[PDB]
Amino acid sequence: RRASKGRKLRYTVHEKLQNFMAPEDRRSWEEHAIDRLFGTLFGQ
Amino acid sequence: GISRDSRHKRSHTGAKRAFYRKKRAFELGRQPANTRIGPKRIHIVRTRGGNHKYRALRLDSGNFAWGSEGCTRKTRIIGVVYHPSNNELVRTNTLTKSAVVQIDAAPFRQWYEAHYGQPLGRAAHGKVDPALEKQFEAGRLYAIISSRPGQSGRADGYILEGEELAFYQRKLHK
Amino acid sequence: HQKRLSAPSHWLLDKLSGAYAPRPSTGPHKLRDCMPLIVFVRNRLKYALNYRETKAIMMQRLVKVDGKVRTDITYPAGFMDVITIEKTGENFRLIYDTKGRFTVHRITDEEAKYKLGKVKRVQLGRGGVPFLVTHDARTIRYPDPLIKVNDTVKIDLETGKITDFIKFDTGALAMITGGRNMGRVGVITHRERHDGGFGIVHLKDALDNTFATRESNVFVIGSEKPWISLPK
Amino acid sequence: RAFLKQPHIFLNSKVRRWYKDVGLGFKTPKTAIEGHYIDKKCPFTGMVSIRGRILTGRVVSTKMHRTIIIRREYLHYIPKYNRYEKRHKNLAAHVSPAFRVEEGDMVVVGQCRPLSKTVRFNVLRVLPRTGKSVKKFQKF
Amino acid sequence: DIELQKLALKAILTWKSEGIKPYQEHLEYLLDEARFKNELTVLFQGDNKILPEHRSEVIPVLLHLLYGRAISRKGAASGRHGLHATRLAIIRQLDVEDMGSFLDIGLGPLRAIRVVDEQGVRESVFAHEPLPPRKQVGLLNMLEAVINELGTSVEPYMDALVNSVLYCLVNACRKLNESLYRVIRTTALKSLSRLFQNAPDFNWVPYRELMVKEIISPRIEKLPVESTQGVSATWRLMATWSSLPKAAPFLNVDKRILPKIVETLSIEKAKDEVKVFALDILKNLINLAQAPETESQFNELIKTELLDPNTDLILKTIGGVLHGQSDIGRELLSSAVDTVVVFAPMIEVSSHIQDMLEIATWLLNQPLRKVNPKVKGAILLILKRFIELDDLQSNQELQRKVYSTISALFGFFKDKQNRQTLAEVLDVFARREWAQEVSDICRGLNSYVEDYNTRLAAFNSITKTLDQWMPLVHNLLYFIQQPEEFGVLSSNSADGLCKFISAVESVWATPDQAAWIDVVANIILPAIYAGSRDPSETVRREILRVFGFLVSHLPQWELVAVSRQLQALRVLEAANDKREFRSKHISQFFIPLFEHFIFDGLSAQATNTIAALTLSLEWQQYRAILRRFISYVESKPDWQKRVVRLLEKEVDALRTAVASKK
RNA sequence: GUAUAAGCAAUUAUACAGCGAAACUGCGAAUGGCUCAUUAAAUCAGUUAUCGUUUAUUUGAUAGUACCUUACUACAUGGAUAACCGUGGUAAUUCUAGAGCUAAUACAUGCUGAAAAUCCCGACUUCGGAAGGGAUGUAUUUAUUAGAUUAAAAACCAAUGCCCUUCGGGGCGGUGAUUCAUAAUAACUUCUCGAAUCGCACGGCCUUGGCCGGCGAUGGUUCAUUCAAAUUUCUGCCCUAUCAACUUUCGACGGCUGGGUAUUGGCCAGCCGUGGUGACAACGGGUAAGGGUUAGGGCUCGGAGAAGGAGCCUGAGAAACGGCUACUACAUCCAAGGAAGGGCAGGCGCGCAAAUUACCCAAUCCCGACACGGGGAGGUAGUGACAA
């Protein structure tokens, strides 16, 4: 194949790259406003 | 991290060998230098035997040879137009070897009108290819870089002319 | 700092020079093809006894090699380098023998005044001038225009001027300086080109023994004309 | 890609083609002389020079860009059998577009500076025969 | 002085001005002695160019600083890269109005000088020196660089430049302390030459005595003896003078200049380069003398004053050159024959055309080693333009000699235009004179050179008298040697040669016998051998036909189908053994024929005939033959068995030969 | 090479002179050696190449490069620091602060006595020596040209000839190869070198004011040579098919283009092509990791780490473990603010056991400004009923 050197996304788990950071949820909004805004974007 | 040894690649028969040794000093290959356009920035690197080689990182001027008539001049460099290796390099305006780039034409036109006499770009020995004449009328020629800016510290090369000139016009249009 | 046994067996040391042996310093002659000055003084000539004695003798301007005073102890003097000692007024020259060992010869000033050196190569130096490289690492500027590779030159040793030359020739007598038949004085009778590396010559003696030595090891001494006094 | 060129011959002049002989009793072919093909690893067009060992062999896989694979057969003496045994060796050599490649022919190659991990030789003179496939065995 | 420069620039920046304000970094970086070239090339052709608004406010201080950096001797290294490349760089990057203000700065006292007045010379100016010669050397080198970088933009600055350089040149020649004035004179003439071919449109007429004082006084009485070595700057000035149209009539002012030029050409101990240089001066003179209206504004004088009173000396000297020494370089030869080509239509009457025609036929019978065939074509054009003067009726022995040459050139040339010019020189040959006979030759060669239907008509018409015949013989054997278009030209030329040899055997009166017999020998027999070595098989067939005609019609002359081929070869064996042969006949006709027969039982019959003929021939020819055969062995690996069978048979013949001669 | 030590030791013409601590400058420490998970033709050994690269030291030669508008000029070159003297801080040793000096072979610039200098040509010539004509280094990098008798090479080659004669005769740079070596022009470099150095003798011309004058030491551009180092070509491992498929899973095989490397190279980045290896034994597995010197035995030669990862520094040669930098794991001093640091050898290892904590670089050998300084190889010595 033409693609060995990273050219295709090898969906393979990485050992050292496994558990770096825990998700810290930092969002000041109660998510109802945000997805109601995603509804009421330009399109509606 | 960077080295030139061939231990890590596979065998000629397609085998993998451990061959575990340490990276010594004579397989050292230094980090690349994206020579870009700017004021003159050159870092000196001493190498084996105490030789000096000049890694040029930011370059403005180089010299170019219009040796068809037998002249060469130090001119500025506007910006790369095409490069055979990497379109990312063409984007990031890098100067390497064999790099076609538009250069300023003013010293060449000065030398032409001084030597032969007729104005150009505004007898029978002073004759120009018409594509080169169009380059002169625009005032920004197509030249090539053939000096290694990384391992020589200078952007020098010959002007494009004739068959290579038209080939590179067609390549630019591609 | 090699051992006495691992030292080359053609500059001789007896069974009492200790387990060690000097290594030659860097100089004109090669490492394997060298005789150092201390070994020439105190092991072959025995004009001294000890390293300190040889140090003192070489420190005062008393030993002259190839017309120039040599200071340091282990200056290499490999092959056909005249060694003038003025307090004895003798001149010694280094040849080989039939077995392949260093042999010292005594000479007076008339034959001691000149050297015979094999030409390594010839090129054009800086400025567009031809220069000539001997095997003694001597460079002669402005040579005779006929002296090619593997020629031999009689050298003045006082002005370094090219006094004479001898040509590589089939039908000439030679001396061997390498190979398994090293040190067998005889006549060149045949040359074989073998274009592609390692040309050979076929060299017989004066007494009907043929053998194959390579041109690099061949060292032209003279057609008959033994310009240096070989030992009788 | 860029425009290919011999390194220092001035083309666009308003007023040639350089090719050197390797020597060793070889003759440059006419396609190398006049054929406008250009390549850096050709000993008659590029700057590669040939020196050292000169070898022969028979091509097996010509299906490659200007590089052939050569089966080197020889007779291996094993002491346990006190007998000669056939052993094939797989080389490579940079093939010039000057010659007419034939599969199964007899080709003379020459040692050069290392052009690739495997490519260490240049072809000099092919000899056209009727060599067959893998099933043919012969010392060469 | 760089420290005084730094303090001066600090003072100018103390003059706080909005004009100098955006450029102070460029000024200090131009002034810092480690940033000069980079600061220059960032000043000019950079992003921050000089704005044209306050350009009149910044340019004077910048130009004085540029003069300081171009005058500095401290930091400069040696060589041209030492300070000469610096001056060239500054002047190349400068501009022309800036150059005018700069040369105002450069010419200190000599800015307002007048070298020429309403009268001719200003001796009151020249007998007073305002400058030391060191500053004059600097000024003059500076101005040479200025002119060399300026080119055609010199036009608004002539009224200062010519005054400066002429004052320097005339003070130098009056000083003719020697080294300074010498280098002054040489670089002065160099700048003058560049100035001349830069500015043609200037009026140079208001001073003539200046060129007089520069040229005639010190040199002309010695000029060949001096210029025997190489070209000079005076020679360059005269060359560009002859190149320019309006500058050429300055050579009339002293009338001995062109005589002494061809006297340099007369001295045969020159390095040949001054010879071809004076020759190119004459080239430009003649091209000017032929040129249209733009040069016919001066042609009538240069016809009537420069070339006319010296054509005799020109041709006498060129003859002394072409008959003085046995060694002439090919460049000098081609260039001399080119000058006489261009001089030919420029003269109408002279005195030495006898000598000219003799030298023409001399250089035409010169061998091909000394003279190239292109050069022989040039002498042919010379012959056409030089024969038409009324001279040939006197001294007929010269005239039968030159006609022998033109005939000889008919089988030599290869080029159609050369053969057209041959037919033309034959045309004017007939126009000069015998006349109707040579006009018959004119129409013959005209319909020879004209295409293929006309050529075959020519062959048949002449198929339907010695000097009539000889050129037809020459072009006839040339059209033998032409192999084939359809082969018809070869066959018709063969038929014509049979007709000629029939005329030959027809006429047998004893002085006609002698003349025609020497002619047919010395032109036909070597042509037979050359066509024998010719590998064209149609040529060999027709040469066998004409050789059969020769041997069958001649025989009183003292020197004379596989199955049928082999039978005829056996007949030839029997002819050998009944009569051995003539040795030259063997060695130069028969051997190459069966050599061709081999390399194209035929081979066995061929080598048997070669065996018998190697018996028949002479040993010295045999020695060369055997060396050629072993050379065939070494060089031709195509027929190993064939050549070695030839070797076996020929040395068996040698063994029988020594056995018989025992 | 640098001495004004406020250091000694003196005088018979007084800058210095003999010895000379400290200090600056130059060299040196790519090993002598220690430990331990191992390396199964990749190392290694023969055998080649470097026309693909580097090299301090070695020895040999070596460099013609002026003038060129400063001129109403310039003509014994600059500035810093150390050692030193004095003022201190802290618990903390050059951990060091402030102040006052002075030298260089340390760091650095460097037109000038002059109307010439130096190369090439050389006509005329009394070997006369020359009238007068052209021209102004090196290193880097690029471009171009030459790198060699003509290219209308239609030459030379058939000298098989031509001409005389007595007919006997006579006359007519290197390589196997390279764009190699080398030379020349255009410019280019924030680019070098082209001796502002030291010791010793001291002689010729006599403008008695100097002008010339030798031997060395140190230094410097190029090219050799040496010592090396780097890759690199054909052959050669022990055993096994309960190892027949392997590689493309760090590109696997090409070619082109560049980057970096001292240089070649999928060594790496783009672009496209389709491979390459294998029953002649690939690949895997096992770990038990010799060559040459030929009567013989003897003799000689033969990966990873310095508490742990990671990065950097000097130098001709190191990824030195010598240093530093941050993280981690330890440990020490303290006035609790802070500071420096990491190895080997010996004894016990039951409560009961057993070969020196020896001497010198004396010889061989090594490293230095260097005859003199310094060497953990080397020899000398002591113990022994294990034997013999």
Whether the Cβ atoms of residue E542 and residue E497 lie closer than 8 Å to each other: no
Whether the Cβ atoms of residue C170 and residue C203 lie closer than 8 Å to each other: no
Which H helix or E strand runs over E652? helix E640-661
Chains E and B touch (3+ CB pairs under 8 A): yes
What is the CA E242 to chain-centroid distance, rounded? 19
Find, among E240, E150, E153, the residue nearest to E204 by Cα. Answer: E240
What dihedral angle (degrees, nearest 10) is formed by the CA atoms of E435, E440, E446, E452? 180
> B152: which 2 tokens?
């020589």
Three-class DSSP category at C119: strand
**Strand F: which of residues 37-76 in chain D lie with Cβ below 7 A?**
39-41, 47-53, 55, 60-61, 63-67, 69, 72-74, 76
Beta bridge partners of D67: D94
Nearest CB partner across the interface for D12, out of B9, B12, B68? B68
CB spacing of D25 vs C195 below 8 angstroms = yes
Q: Give the mutation candidate from E35, E41, E197, E240 for the B interface (greatest B CB count, under 10 A).
A: E41
Chains that touch A (3 or more CB pairs under 8 A): none
Distant-in-sequence, close-in-space partners of E300: CB < 8 Å, separation ≥ 6: none
Three-class DSSP category at B54: strand
Whether the Cβ atoms of residue B77 and residue B87 lie closer than 8 Å to each other: no
Calpha distance C97→C230 (Å, rounded): 10
Q: What angle do CA E417, E423, E427 make, to 5 degrees?
A: 140
Distance between start and end Cα atoms, chain A: 47
What is the CA C120 to chain-centroid distance, rounded? 13
Three-class DSSP category at B76: strand
Calpha distance E221→E215 (Å, rounded): 10
Distant-in-sequence, close-in-space partners of E261: CB < 8 Å, separation ≥ 6: E238, E278, E281, E282
Resolution in A: 4.0
Calpha distance E23→D88 (Å, rounded): 77
| The residue to which tokens 């504004």 are assigned | E297
Output the distance from D115 CA to F249 C1' rounded to whole Å. 27
Calpha distance C148→C119 (Å, rounded): 8
- Beta-sheet strands, E only, within B5-158: 36-37, 41-47, 51-59, 61-66, 71-82, 99-104, 140-145, 156-158
Find, among B153, B148, B164, B155, the residue nearest to B53 by Cα. Answer: B153
Find, among E319, E309, E325, the residue nearest to E340 by Cα. Answer: E319
Q: What angle do CA E235, E237, E242 make, to 5 degrees?
A: 95
How many other β-carbons are positioned within 10 Å of the β-carbon of residue C113?
A: 17
Sheet of strand B41-47: strand arrangement: B36-37, B51-59, B41-47
Beta bridge partners of E450: none
Q: Give the mutation candidate from B61, B72, B75, B78 for the E interface (greatest E CB count, under 10 A).
A: B61
Instruction: Find the helix packing angle between E640-661 and E619-635, rounded to 10°.
Output: 160
> E70: which 2 tokens?
């171009």
What is the CA E374 to chain-centroid distance, rounded? 10
Q: Is the dihedral of CA E50, E53, E56, E58 positive or negative?
A: negative
What is the CA E48 to chain-centroid distance, rounded? 53
Beta bridge partners of C107: C91
Chains that touch E (3 or more CB pairs under 8 A): B
Alpha-helix runs per DSSP H in E15-157: 24-31, 36-43, 55-71, 85-93, 96-106, 123-126, 133-150
Distant-in-sequence, close-in-space partners of E378: CB < 8 Å, separation ≥ 6: E334, E337, E338, E341
CB spacing of D12 vs B161 below 8 angstroms = yes
Find, among C101, C105, C122, C98, the residue nearest to C45 by Cα. Answer: C105
Find, among C21, C25, C46, C43, the residue nearest to C34 by Cα. Answer: C25
- Beta-sheet strands, E only, within C135-181: 139-141, 152-155, 162-166, 173-176
Chains that touch B (3 or more CB pairs under 8 A): D, E
Provide the number of CB pairs (under 8 Å) joining chain C to chain D.
7
Calpha distance E353→E385 (Å, rounded): 11
For residue C195, list chain D residues with Cβ-Cβ distance below 8 A: 23-25
Calpha distance E489→B79 (Å, rounded): 67
Integer angstrom CA distances of residue D140 from D55, D106, E301 = 10, 9, 87
What is the CA E435 to chain-centroid distance, rounded? 36
What Rg, from alpha-carbon coordinates, does chain B have? 21
Whether the Cβ atoms of residue D59 and residue D108 lie closer than 8 Å to each other: no
Sheet of strand C200-204: strand arrangement: C210-214, C200-204, C186-192, C173-176, C218-222
Give one word for E79, left, alpha or beta, with left for phi > 0 and alpha for psi -120 to 50.
left
Q: Tell me, what DSSP letter sits at residue E303? A: I
Sequence letter at residue E644: V
For residue D52, list chain C residues with Cβ-Cβ distance below 8 A: 197
> C36: which 2 tokens?
């150092």
Q: How many CA atoms lie within 13 A of E556 on its CB side?
A: 8
Integer angstrom CA distances of residue B65 from B141, B146, B147, B159, E40 = 12, 11, 12, 6, 20
Counting other chains too, the contacts that E335-338 makes at CB distance below 8 Å and 24 or more residues apart are E335/E276, E335/E279, E335/E280, E336/E279, E337/E363, E337/E375, E337/E378, E337/E379, E337/E382, E338/E283, E338/E378
Distant-in-sequence, close-in-space partners of E224: CB < 8 Å, separation ≥ 6: E260, E263, E264, E266, E267
> B4: which 2 tokens?
């030139």
Q: Tell me, what DSSP letter sits at residue B94? A: B
Burial of residue B42 (CB within 10 Å: 0-12, 13-18, 19+) is middle
Q: How many angstroms away from the CA of D44 is the closest CA of chain C?
A: 18
User: What one-character-per-residue DSSP string does E440-478 give?
Assistant: HHHHHHHHHH--HHHHHHHHHHHH--HHHHHHHHHHHHH
Q: Is the dihedral of CA A18, A22, A26, A27 positive or negative?
A: positive
Distant-in-sequence, close-in-space partners of E575: CB < 8 Å, separation ≥ 6: none
Find, among B59, B107, B65, the residue nearest to B79 by Cα. Answer: B59
Beta bridge partners of D127: D106
Chains C and B touch (3+ CB pairs under 8 A): no
Beta bridge partners of B59: B37
Whether the Cβ atoms of residue E30 and residue E40 lie closer than 8 Å to each other: yes
Count helices and strands (H / E) in chain B. Answer: 5, 8
Instruction: Find the helix packing angle between E602-616 and E640-661, rounded to 10°.
Output: 30
Q: What angle do CA E514, E519, E520 make, to 5 degrees?
A: 100
Whether the Cβ atoms of residue E222 and residue E178 lie closer than 8 Å to each other: no
> E348: which 2 tokens?
């109408």
Q: How many CA atoms lie within 13 A of D26 on its CB side?
A: 24
Q: How many angstroms away from the CA of C198 is the closest CA of chain D?
A: 10
Residue D55 has φ and ψ, to the nearest 5°, of -125, 170
Report the b/e string of E137-157 with b at 16+ CB within 10 A. Answer: bbbbbbbbbbbbbbbebbeeb
What Rg, from alpha-carbon coordinates, does chain E have? 38
Report the b/e string of E548-570 with b at 16+ CB within 10 A. Answer: ebbeebbeeeeeeeeeeeeeebe
Q: How many CA atoms lie within 13 A of E478 on its CB side?
A: 20
What Rg, from alpha-carbon coordinates, does chain A have? 19
Q: Max Cα separation, chain B?
A: 72
> B97: which 2 tokens?
């070897």
Sequence letter at residue C113: K
- Beta-sheet strands, E only, within chain C: 63-65, 68-69, 83-85, 90-95, 103-107, 115-125, 129-134, 139-141, 152-155, 162-166, 173-176, 186-192, 200-204, 210-214, 218-222
What is the CA E47 to chain-centroid distance, rounded? 51
Count helices and strands (H / E) in chain D. Answer: 1, 6
Integer angstrom CA distances of residue B122 from B137, D114, E50 = 6, 52, 22
Provide the number of CB pairs (under 8 Å) joining chain B to chain E.
34
Whether the Cβ atoms of residue C111 and residue C229 lie closer than 8 Å to each other: yes
Q: Is the dihedral of CA B128, B133, B137, B142 positive or negative?
A: negative
